[PDB]
Design brief:
Chain G: This is NADH dehydrogenase [ubiquinone] 1 alpha subcomplex subunit 8. Chain G: Complex I is composed of 45 different subunits. Chain G: Belongs to the complex I NDUFA8 subunit family. Chain G: It is found in: Mitochondrion intermembrane space. The structure is cut from a larger assembly and holds eight protein chains of eight kinds. With 104 residues, chain D is mainly α. Chain D is built from six helices and no strands. Chain G has five helices and no strands. Chain H has 114 residues and is mostly helical. The longest helix of chain H is centred in the C-terminal third of the chain and has 24 residues. The radius of gyration of chain H is 26 Å and the shape is flat. The chains are: A mainly alpha (174), B mainly alpha (121), C mainly alpha (347), D mainly alpha (104), E mainly alpha (97), F mainly alpha (140), G mainly alpha (169), H mainly alpha (114). The structure holds cardiolipin, ligand PLX and 1,2-dioleoyl-sn-glycero-3-phosphoethanolamine (PEE). Cardiolipin sits at the interface of chains B and G.
């Protein structure tokens, strides 16, 4: 078909190719933006929409901004673009050839020999009937977190709280 | 892991009611009194580290230590005997469970068997 | 940082490990480590030094990447068996990574390089706690996944931890780095026998913790650090140097002493498995481990390095703030040898 | 030391989240509930070790339930077969305009 | 396993190799780590969407939380190291690898 | 991979010395690449050409050691025609050190390498003869 | 190799009323057609295999057909006056029309004469008699492998105890 | 599809505005005209390090609230669960901790913002 989810996976992976190469944190922040929107799109394709919008909100709408603060604290004059060094750009190309070899393996249509077998063909094939009443599986699925899963709520509450305490006990020391 | 995960039994209880039936260690089991002296010497080092006039001082606390370790040493001995008695039991039950794999081998005598002799030279 | 907060941190570390020791679901284990981390970093940052900061940077950076690989390998396990219960793992490519992640969490070689450094960066309080309490949780999960471990992979790190735990121990002066190589060496002995029989592991664990409690309480008691700094102590409070000697020998596992109990059960267990060669190499190298305990003993109690004059006034002043738990931690870590059989209490 | 205090005290605070079945809100079925149910009913007193022998078949069917691995290798073999016949065969006319829309 | 999963896993492998090739100022590493986090998230969520294993719909978000949480911590340490230098990994006080 | 040692394992006996020697050369090359890998990893060569010089060094050396070891072993097998006793490897073991002795241009290191590499190899053969488990399965 | 019903044997003339029209009157449809219906679903959830209950799955079709045949001869113009009102909304919400339902429900309650169920009524689970056996093992499944013995006696003291190494007792 | 189509038309629209923005005035760029603005007089140096603890000291707190609201989101749907008393405590609980966290910051003087 469109293979649209899969090509999104490809743009995702190159999003990590330009991201995992390390050319000033700001451009890497761009890398996680691209990989971020691609991510939420990909998970949206299975219809877990609420989650894809969590990451598109909580992650990218949160994190990469605070990184857009760290660079204000780090920067250094003349930050490097991807093209600005032989090892960085060499690295980016180094990612591209590999992932392209994977796509060529997709052209081969044979199961992947790397690491462990990748069964091949289109993504749609694994889908099953999504039949349900006037509610998505996800909705009540996460709604369950409160009523039906109090324990996790306890440890997350406690954890985040004392994480705030830790931020205090690091920054105040100075 | 063995023993752990054994059918029946419950996790955190230190000591099964299934024990109890085993005789308790007697009051002056030498292992136990050794727990005594262990506590004793610990009580003594407690003085020596903190200067103190060793031995005569704090004879009080020293008595606390020896009573402490002998006390815990007691129950620890009970669980010891319980555990070993347990593995012995499971072992014998299993040897009845599979008689075939634990053959009652016939015992030929020395007259019956040949064995090579090696002269010392 | 006021004690009321410090204690909440340290208690949430205790909780952050207890949680690993309780929960059966994997996600709560990864939460167990994860909560453990956040609560572990700040306590390294008390007093705060330009040095300590990069110490914590090391520790966090490695623990974070370890936890990452771990969660990845969990997810792969789920992908190929749809489970969350601990139990056996069902895909070797995942299993080896869970072994790796835990291998960082113990600090086993060749992942080990962070541990000698981090220890250098913090005070002996935070140090001791790092070398004992942090060693619980990852072992607490390894005991649960002993059933399916790929023994080859485990024994290789288990040995190499002992060689590296040796050679890197002969070289250093300041004690904290040495304590680091001691622990990094004992973990080789714990994680070695793990595929074969976990109860021996937990035994060895208890002895190790008791031991390093003995040492760090002593170093605290004398506030020694660099070897020379330790050397002066023979004249001021002779007893405690005269006791570091012994606890060191119990590290060395000279046979009357308690520290021999681990090795000598381990050698038993592995020998039932045949595998006769491995314990021989292991036991031979443990000697090499002993030798720098001995040299360190020479700096201290057996021989008197020259005293500095200024020491004399210090003679008038008794040490204070006694640490109650100490004497028992010495004695248990030494005299207990004719109480091996009690190990079966651990079933 | 897998302390299992949650079991001795019966708190169950963790246990619910485990397993494909095990009561889920609005009783929504797992996609592979059945093979899983059979496979677990197979698993009790057998405990862990012998369990990887005797219950293997059940776990296998459960595996294919999870990944649909084999049915995909097959279905792939068919679709790749069809290309060879693409000039030798014209497949099926209805797919294009059959009673499938009348079918409901 | 369908090729898409293989692709995300590979994105993980790159999200690790990038962390470990590890160069210059370390802020890049906190990025690469967060990228790693994101790949694990997505790889989890696709699965929970797959088998309709509904309870586990709660996990990915919870995963996300702590993971984001530690990263949130990480910057703070960087601050301190940035505080005395203007950050670079190239400068480390500690001895013996 | 284990398949490679498995390749070397089917000697058989010592027949066709080349077939064996190629495999030993392969193993020596592998270990050479690993040692070179960590060496580069932990001793930042500075100027990458020097780094490939380094790896060329170690790789070629270990490959050489494996080659000469393999062929001297099999030749001794095909000449003494004993051919199964452990000493049959030991010469090659002793030979191997000399190879290592040549590249290092030192009598000392070559001399020690002769003895210890020899004893190690002898123990290996002895082990194949005796099924020593090195990494025994949990069994217990 | 899997058993399947012939392409024909399944075949039945379809209900072909549109979904909006269907919904407009379904609220009565549950009230009238019923016994075949619940027999059907109870038959389904028993053995899970559809083929087993496919025939009842025919019977329900024809039953519904008879239902609409009863409809068309009587109420229809009021009926069309009703579902036309409803199909106009893409939410299919009942609240938007309602008033026509006065027309329709009255013309039925008189001219064909029987009541509309109240809102709290259809949801409740219904008792249903059935003659066919409940299936032996619906999962088919296999044998349950023999459990390890939970054998026990009583604990005599260890034969010499702590037999490891030199310890005597 | 639907949404991807509107994304494409929007982005292409904007990019079109960019291209008609540059390739149109068709006049003379030159140096010093292109020099960065600095209220007349030339800059004393390119932008460097406007460092402040008072940035992260709060911004991090932002991040740890945003993670919290991420948990608040399930609430509207969770409200319809069959057993609210099991839920309701937690519904309050996190908010308390949210507040609690803030409260802790409120008075350790960690919230100096600015
Ligand atoms: C009142 C206060 C005083 C109470 C103490 C009174 C005397 C108690 C006593 O010592 O004898 C126990 C005594 C009789 O002992 P037993 O059961 O007949 O066995 C003694 C044999 O030696 C058989 O004993 P065993 O079978 O237990 O053998 C000992 C065995 C297992 O037992 C042990 O491990 C203990 C040995 C370790 C050292 C003992 C420390 C000193 C005590 O250990 C070993 O064989 C190997 C030892 C490991 C060596 C490690 C390396 C060393 C270098 O028990 C009593 O009930 C006597 C109490 C009578 C009234 C007391 C009031 C008088 C005032
Ligand atoms: C800040 C400084 C750092 C401090 C860090 C140190 C912390 C030390 C913690 C040591 C852990 C010990 C465990 C004790 C918990 C008590 C709970 C006890 O009742 O557990 C029961 C089991 O009983 C315990 O086994 C009792 C252990 C008692 C400890 C001492 C035993 C004998 C010591 C042997 C060495 C010789 C020294 C003896 C001299 C006195 C139930 O567990 P079970 O469900 O059944 O099986 C669990 C799985 N296992 C076996 C693999 C763990
Ligand atoms: C592979 C792993 C197996 C290990 C193989 C054997 C390991 C045992 C050896 C462990 C310690 C060996 C050396 C450690 C200490 C050391 O190097 O000391 C060298 C030092 C040099 O002086 P410096 O310290 O540099 O400074 C001088 C200032 N005045 O001098 C010494 O102390 C050397 C003498 C002491 C060590 C000698 C030990 C005796 C031989 C060791 C093993 C022999 C095997 C026994 C024979 C029986 C065969 C089964």
């Amino acid at each position: 078909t469109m293979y649209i989810a899969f090509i999104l996976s490809t743009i995702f992976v190159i999003g990590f190719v330009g991201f995992s190469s390390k050319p000033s944190p700001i451009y890497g922040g761009l890398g996680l933006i691209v990989s971020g929107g691609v991510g939420c799109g990909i998970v949206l394709n299975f219809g877990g929409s609420f989650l894809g919008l969590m990451v598109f909100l909580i992650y990218l709408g949160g994190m990469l901004v605070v990184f857009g603060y760290t660079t204000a604290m780090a920067t250094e004059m003349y930050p490097e673009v991807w093209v600005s060094n032989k090892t960085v750009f060499g690295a980016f190309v180094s990612g591209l050839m590999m992932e392209f070899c994977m796509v060529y393996y997709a052209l081969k249509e044979e199961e992947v020999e790397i690491i462990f077998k990748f069964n091949g063909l289109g993504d749609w094939v694994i889908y099953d009937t999504g039949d349900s009443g006037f509610f998505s599986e996800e909705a009540m699925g996460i709604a369950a977190l409160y009523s039906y899963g109090t324990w996790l709520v306890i440890v997350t509450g406690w954890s985040l709280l004392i994480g705030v305490v830790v931020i205090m006990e690091i920054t105040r020391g100075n | 892991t063995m023993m752990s995960g054994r059918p029946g039994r419950v996790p955190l209880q230190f000591l099964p009611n299934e024990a109890r039936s085993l005789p308790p260690p007697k009051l002056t089991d030498p292992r136990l009194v050794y727990m005594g002296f262990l506590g004793y010497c610990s009580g003594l080092i407690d003085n020596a580290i903190r200067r103190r006039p060793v031995v005569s001082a704090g004879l009080h606390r020293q008595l606390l230590y020896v009573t402490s370790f002998v006390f815990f040493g007691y129950y620890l001995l009970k669980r010891q005997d319980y555990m070993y008695a347990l593995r012995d039991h499971d072992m014998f039950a299993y040897v009845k469970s599979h008689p075939e794999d634990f053959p009652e081998k016939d015992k030929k005598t020395y007259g019956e068997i040949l064995e090579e002799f090696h002269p010392v030279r | 940082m006021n004690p009321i907060i410090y204690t909440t941190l340290i208690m949430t570390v205790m909780s952050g490990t207890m949680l690993v020791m309780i929960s059966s679901h994997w996600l709560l284990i990864w939460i167990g480590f994860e909560m453990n981390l956040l609560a572990m970093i700040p306590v390294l940052m008390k007093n705060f030094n330009p040095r300590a900061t990069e110490a914590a940077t090391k520790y966090f950076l490695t623990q974070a990447t370890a936890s990452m690989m771990l969660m990845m390998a969990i997810i792969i396990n789920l992908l190929y068996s749809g489970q969350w219960t601990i139990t056996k793992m069902f895909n070797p490519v995942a299993m080896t990574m869970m072994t790796m992640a835990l291998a960082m969490k113990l600090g086993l070689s060749p992942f080990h390089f962070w541990v000698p450094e981090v220890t250098q960066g913090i005070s002996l309080q935070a140090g001791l706690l790092l070398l004992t309490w942090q060693k619980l949780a990852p072992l607490s999960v390894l005991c649960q996944i002993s059933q399916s471990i790929n023994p080859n992979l485990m024994l290789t790190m288990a040995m190499l931890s002992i060689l590296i735990g040796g050679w890197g121990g002969l070289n250093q002066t300041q004690l904290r780095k040495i304590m680091a190589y001691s622990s990094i060496a004992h973990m080789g002995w714990m994680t070695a026998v793990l595929p074969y029989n976990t109860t021996m592991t937990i035994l060895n664990l208890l002895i190790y913790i008791t031991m390093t409690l003995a040492m760090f309480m002593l170093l605290i008691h004398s506030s020694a650090t660099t070897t020379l700094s330790l050397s002066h102590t023979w004249n001021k409070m002779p007893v405690i140097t005269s006791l570091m000697m012994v606890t060191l020998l119990s590290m060395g596992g000279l046979p009357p002493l308690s520290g021999f109990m681990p090795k000598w059960m381990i050698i038993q267990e592995m020998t039932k498995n045949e595998s006769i060669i491995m314990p021989t190499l292991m036991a031979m190298t443990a000697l090499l481990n002993l030798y720098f305990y001995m040299r360190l003993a020479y700096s201290s109690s057996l021989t008197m390095f020259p005293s500095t004059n200024n020491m004399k006034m210090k003679w008038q002043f008794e040490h204070t703030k006694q640490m109650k738990l100490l004497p028992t931690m010495i004695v248990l870590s030494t005299l207990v040898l004719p109480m091996t059989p009690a190990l079966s209490s651990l079933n | 030391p897998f302390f299992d205090v949650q079991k001795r005290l019966g708190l169950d605070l963790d246990r619910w989240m485990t397993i494909q079945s095990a009561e889920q809100p609005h009783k929504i079925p797992g996609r592979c509930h059945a093979f899983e149910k059979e496979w677990i009913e197979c698993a009790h007193g057998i405990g862990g070790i012998r369990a990887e022998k005797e219950c293997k078949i059940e776990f296998d069917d459960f595996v294919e339930c999870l990944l649909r691995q084999k049915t995909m290798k097959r279905l792939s073999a068919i679709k790749r077969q069809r290309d060879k016949l693409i000039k030798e065969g014209k497949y099926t006319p209805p797919p294009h305009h059959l009673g499938k829309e009348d079918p409901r | 396993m369908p090729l898409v999963y293989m692709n995300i896993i590979m994105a993980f492998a790159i999200a690790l190799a990038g962390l470990l090739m590890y160069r210059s100022h370390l802020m890049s590493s906190l990025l690469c780590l967060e990228g790693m986090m994101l790949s694990l998230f997505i790889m989890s969520t696709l699965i929970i969407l797959n088998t309709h294993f509904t309870l586990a719909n709660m996990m990915p978000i919870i995963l996300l939380v702590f993971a984001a949480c530690e990263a949130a911590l990480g910057l703070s340490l960087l601050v301190m190291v940035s505080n005395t230098y203007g950050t670079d990994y190239v400068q480390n006080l500690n001895l013996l690898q | 991979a284990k398949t490679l040692l498995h390749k070397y394992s089917d000697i058989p006996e010592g027949t066709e010395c080349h077939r064996k020697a190629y495999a030993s050369t392969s193993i020596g090359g592998a270990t050479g690449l690993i040692v070179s890998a960590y060496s580069i990893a932990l001793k930042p060569p500075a100027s990458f050409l020097e780094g490939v010089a380094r790896t060329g060094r170690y790789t070629f050396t270990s490959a050489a050691i494996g080659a000469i070891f393999g062929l001297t072993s099999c030749i001794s097998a095909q000449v003494r025609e004993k051919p199964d006793d452990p000493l049959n490897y030991f010469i090659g073991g002793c030979a191997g050190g000399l190879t290592l002795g040549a590249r290092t241009r030192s009598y000392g290191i070559g001399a020690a390498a002769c003895a210890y590499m020899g004893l190690t190899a002898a123990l290996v053969k002895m082990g194949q003869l005796e099924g020593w488990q090195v990494f025994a399965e949990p069994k217990v | 190799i899997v058993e399947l019903p012939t392409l024909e044997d399944l075949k039945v003339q379809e209900v072909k009323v549109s979904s909006s029209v269907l919904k407009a009157a379904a609220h009565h449809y549950g009230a009238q057609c019923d016994k075949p219906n619940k027999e059907f679903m109870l038959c389904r959830w028993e053995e899970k295999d559809p083929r087993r209950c496919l025939e009842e799955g025919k019977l329900v079709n024809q039953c519904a057909l008879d239902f609409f045949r009863q409809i068309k001869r009587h109420c229809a113009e009021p009926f069309t006056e009703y579902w036309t009102c409803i199909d106009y909304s893409g939410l299919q919400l009942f609240r938007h029309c309602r008033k026509q339902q006065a027309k329709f429900d009255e013309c039925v309650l008189d001219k064909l004469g029987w009541v509309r169920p109240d809102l709290g009524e259809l949801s409740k689970v219904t008792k249903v008699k059935t003659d066919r056996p409940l299936p032996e093992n619906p999962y088919h499944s296999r044998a349950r492998p023999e459990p390890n013995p939970e054998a026990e006696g009583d604990l005599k003291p260890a034969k010499h105890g702590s037999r490891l190494f030199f310890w005597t007792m | 599809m639907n949404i991807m189509l509107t994304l494409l038309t929007n982005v292409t629209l904007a990019s079109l505005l960019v291209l008609i923005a540059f390739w149109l005035p068709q006049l003379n760029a030159y140096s010093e005209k292109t020099s960065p603005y600095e209220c007349g007089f030339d800059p004393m140096g390119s932008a460097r390090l406007p460092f402040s603890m008072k940035f992260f000291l709060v911004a991090i707190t932002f991040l740890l609230f945003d993670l919290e609201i991420a948990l608040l989101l399930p609430l509207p749907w969770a409200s319809q669960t069959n057993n609210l008393k099991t839920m309701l405590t937690m519904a309050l609980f996190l908010l308390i901790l949210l507040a609690a966290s803030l409260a802790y910051e409120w008075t350790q003087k960690g919230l100096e913002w600015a």
